[PDB]
């Protein structure tokens, strides 16, 4: 997203844009035909009834007939802690079920309790700022990252790009972290700034919430 590359069109058909008054503000992941998964802080201080959930999008600055738009029917949290940024996950049930096609597909999750060690290669993605120098991204961006444990907490999955200044940025909150084809992270927060090259980006650890997620979507 900072220092990444354009995704191939609809390469990640589980990717979702959350929008208010036309503006993308957070990402999300389609986890069932009628359930989207994002970060809790993304909806902590907004009018949820005005949130538009956009699936099948690639370039947010152009008109795309592939897109499917939904409203948020209800939300489910799992003890979000705004002070310490713990449990930063929310599930938004849609006002309907998405049509599953070449542009809109359901993501797949890891098993409960799965912890990823140092060095696992993952892909982050989102429509956030391109570094604030190019502004917000029009085309969905992706970035190759590696899981790290240093300068981080057990309550997060943290990623770094070694050797260059790259990482997630503002607007990427709620977007998935994909490792081995499974959604292991939801973008949560950065330290000091985007793409510092010194601190890892921190994601909500999806695998620690899987039990909870299932009790909502199954």
């Amino acid at each position: 997203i900072v220092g990444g590359r354009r995704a191939r069109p609809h390469a990640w058909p589980f990717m979702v844009s959350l929008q208010l008054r036309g503006g993308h503000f957070c990402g999300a992941t389609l986890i069932a035909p009628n359930f989207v998964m994002s970060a809790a802080h993304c909806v902590a201080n907004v009018n949820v009834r005005a949130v538009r959930v956009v699936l099948g999008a690639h370039n947010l600055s152009r008109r795309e007939p592939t897109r499917q738009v939904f409203a948020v029917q209800r939300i489910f949290e799992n003890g979000y802690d705004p002070v310490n940024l713990l449990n930063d996950i929310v599930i938004l049930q849609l006002n309907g079920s998405a049509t599953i096609n070449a542009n809109v597909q359901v993501a797949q999750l890891p098993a409960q309790g799965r912890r990823l060690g140092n060095g696992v290669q993952c892909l982050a993605m989102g429509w956030g700022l391109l570094g604030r120098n190019r502004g917000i991204a029009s085309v969905l961006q992706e970035l190759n990252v590696t899981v790290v444990t240093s300068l981080c907490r057990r309550s997060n999955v943290c990623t770094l790009v070694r050797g260059r200044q790259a990482g997630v940025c503002f607007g990427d909150s709620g977007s998935p972290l994909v490792c081995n084809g499974l959604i292991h992270g939801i973008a949560s927060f950065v330290r000091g700034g985007c793409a510092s090259g010194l601190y890892p980006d921190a994601f909500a650890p999806v695998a620690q919430f899987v039990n909870w997620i299932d009790s909502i979507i199954q």
Partner: protein, 103 residues
């Protein structure tokens, strides 16, 4: 008009508040991050009350509270360097209340 929103804010340092009535300007219908807004709050603190980064780092507490148009409030700890990776609308901020206590 329609170019800037004028967000009222107050600053209290050590229980003392100057009695002017002041507003922070944001581009209307724009988006900003907690880094952008935190940096604006820190610049206001320094320019208006001479509060330095070193004074924030060494304060007993240093926060600011966002009142949102939907009525919810969020407290931001100026002593922290962690920022959620989201964007929010400039039109959604109703008030900002900055409070620094050295002890």
């Amino acid at each position: 008009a329609k170019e800037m929103q004028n967000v009222p804010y107050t600053i209290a340092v050590d229980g003392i508040m100057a009695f002017n009535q002041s507003y922070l300007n944001l581009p209307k219908d724009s988006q900003l991050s907690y880094l952008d807004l935190g940096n604006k709050v820190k610049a206001l603190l320094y320019d208006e009350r001479g509060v330095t980064p070193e004074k924030i780092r060494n304060a007993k507490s240093a926060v600011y509270t966002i009142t949102w148009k939907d009525g919810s409030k969020k407290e931001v700890d100026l002593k922290k360097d962690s920022y959620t990776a989201n964007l929010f609308d400039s039109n959604s901020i109703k008030q900002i209340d900055i409070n620094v206590k050295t002890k």
